[PDB]
Every structure is written in C-alpha cells, then in structure tokens.
C-alpha cells in the first residue's frame, strides 16, 4: 500500500476539462419505449380478469 495525500495549491480553479471528441453512441437513440409493468412489477388491477 502507498497512502498519498493531495492538497490543492491554487486559490481558484487551476484545472480545466472540456468535452473534446465523441467516438460513438452507446444507445440506439431510438423510440422503443420502456415498459411500465417491468418497472412496476407489483401493481395489478382490482378486478382479476
């Protein structure tokens, strides 16, 4: 093990990130809607049939 400790040496934000380049799309960007019975697997109708 090697315990390290870091302490910031600036009064303000000394580091800047930016969204640079996009490789691909993980999702489908589709219209296939999600299912509410899956996200709510317990609620049923009061009548059975």
């Amino acid at each position: 093990t090697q315990n390290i400790n870091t302490v910031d040496m600036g009064l303000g934000y000394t580091s800047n990130t930016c969204v640079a380049y996009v490789n691909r799309v993980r999702t489908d960007m589709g219209v296939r809607v999600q299912d509410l019975f899956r996200v709510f697997p317990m609620n049923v109708y009061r009548h059975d049939e």
Partner: protein
C-alpha cells in the same frame, strides 16, 4: 401510439389516490329524498 401500450394501460396512471393525497395537503380555498 400503440408501442406505448406498455405505458398507457398501466394501473398506476388510473390511481388518483396519491394525487388526492398530496392534493389534500394544500389549503382548500372557499372562494336526499328524490320522491317529493
């Protein structure tokens, strides 16, 4: 619309009792014999 059948006819949209429950909490403003 039909692919949203997995969302439309779910029972929790047809259950207004939580909506009525959180509707009771706000303040309500104020502003039988059928024979005879």
């Amino acid at each position: 619309f039909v692919d949203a059948l997995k969302t439309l006819c779910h029972p929790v949209l047809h259950e207004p009792a939580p909506c009525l429950q959180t509707f009771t909490e706000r303040g309500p403003p104020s502003e039988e014999p059928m024979g005879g």
